[PDB]
């Protein structure tokens, strides 16, 4: 389980809301461990995986598994606090520094992009 | 279109010869239409042709060449098909045993009676296991 | 009906094939006087044992399906001789029979699929 990754993609969010750090370059780490950490959590799998995993629960009928629509949930709710703080902080920076730093952020927009879509 | 792809051999020569079988196999890759391509089901009696099949020729090279392609990506199903095609057995039973045991470590509620994984170990058991079965023990 | 159950069948075939298998990896070191008459004695067992694997796999296959109804619709005068065949006259062969049986298996419907094109393989190879 990637239980052990989840604290660390705490501390990402913290750093990047505080934006602590001269360097857009320790921003440009952050942006890439969540990035990975996004992707990681939901392994390519797509609605036809989560109608199965809803059939499921149906409804327990015995016992379930829901273990990764309980992990999504969990990723989401952390980034929403963190997020309304990190989200102005990635956008600003976005544009300037970096252009480098760049490829990295807008990558981790998109990924968080879908979960957290909706 | 493999009956377009077809007519490059009408161009008789080496060359236009390639070109179709390397034609035929792009289409193969990245179109994926495995079974309408390729072939499908044994029920011991082979491989039931495929369109190109009944064109002929070059055909287990490209399924090594998809099958590994589906290994990459981790498209496992197409593999397992891709192998039963390219009749290496052992191969299929053994990603097969991979795919039914993990989906049984889990949680509780799913399975019905009439397909999946478990449908299709069903499916290869019954179907080699009687004959002259090529599988490890 | 065979006298032999599947479950039976599969076993017996089962373990001929690992023997089988076995004989066939390590066959150099049996074949190729005193010598030349162990390579003769081993080439015949080893032969032997394929021999009983390919009757073994046709029995496999007849346990498929709708073996009864063709053999008593088959059987003539022949018969007599057909019924008292054991599996010893199988395994070195009555071939024959076998044949023309074969092809009503893989004439009429029975043969299903793959089993059928093993059939014409076999007729083809050694028939």
């Not at chain 3, 019924?83 to 299903?112: H, M, P, Q």
Request: some cysteine; aromatic content about 6%; proline content about 2%.
């Amino acid at each position: 389980g990637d239980s052990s990754l989840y604290i660390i993609l705490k501390k990402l969010l913290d750093f990047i809301l505080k934006t602590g750090g001269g360097f857009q370059r320790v921003r440009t780490h952050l942006y890439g461990s969540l990035l990975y950490y996004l992707q990681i959590a939901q392994r390519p799998d797509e609605p036809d995986t989560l109608e199965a995993a809803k059939k499921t629960m149906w409804e327990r009928l015995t016992a379930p598994e829901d273990v990764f629509s309980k992990l999504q949930r969990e990723n989401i709710a952390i980034i929403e606090s963190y997020g309304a703080a990190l989200m102005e902080v990635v956008c600003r920076d976005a544009c300037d520094g970096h252009e480098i730093g760049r490829m990295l952020a807008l990558a981790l927009l998109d990924r968080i992009v879908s979960v957290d879509k909706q | 279109a493999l009956q377009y792809f077809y007519f490059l051999r009408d161009e008789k020569d080496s060359q236009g010869e390639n070109m179709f079988l390397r034609c035929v196999s792009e289409l193969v890759i990245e179109s994926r239409e495995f079974d309408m391509i390729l072939g499908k089901l044994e029920n011991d009696g082979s491989r039931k042709p495929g369109v190109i099949d009944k064109f002929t020729s070059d055909t287990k090279p490209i399924i090594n060449k998809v099958a590994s392609v589906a290994e990459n990506k981790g498209l496992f199903e197409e593999a397992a098909k891709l192998y039963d095609l390219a009749k290496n057995a052992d191969k299929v039973l053994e990603l097969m045993n991979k795919l039914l045991s993990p989906v049984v470590p889990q949680i509780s509620a799913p399975q019905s009676n009439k397909e999946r994984l478990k449908n299709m170990a069903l499916s290869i058991a019954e179907r080699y296991r009687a004959q002259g079965i090529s599988a490890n023990k | 009906e065979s006298s032999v159950p599947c479950q039976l069948l599969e076993s017996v075939l089962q373990e001929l094939k690992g023997l089988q298998e076995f004989l066939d990896r390590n066959s150099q070191f049996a074949g190729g006087e005193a010598q030349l008459s162990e390579k003769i004695s081993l080439q015949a067992i080893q032969q032997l044992v394929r021999k009983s694997y390919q009757a073994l796999a046709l029995w496999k296959l007849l346990c498929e399906h709708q073996f009864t109804i063709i053999v008593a619709e088959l059987q003539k005068e022949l018969q007599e001789q057909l019924k008292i065949t054991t599996f010893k006259d199988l395994v070195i062969r009555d071939k024959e029979l076998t044949g023309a049986l074969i092809a009503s298996l893989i004439n009429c419907y029975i043969r299903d699929n793959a089993a059928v094109d093993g059939i014409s393989l076999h007729l083809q190879d050694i028939c």
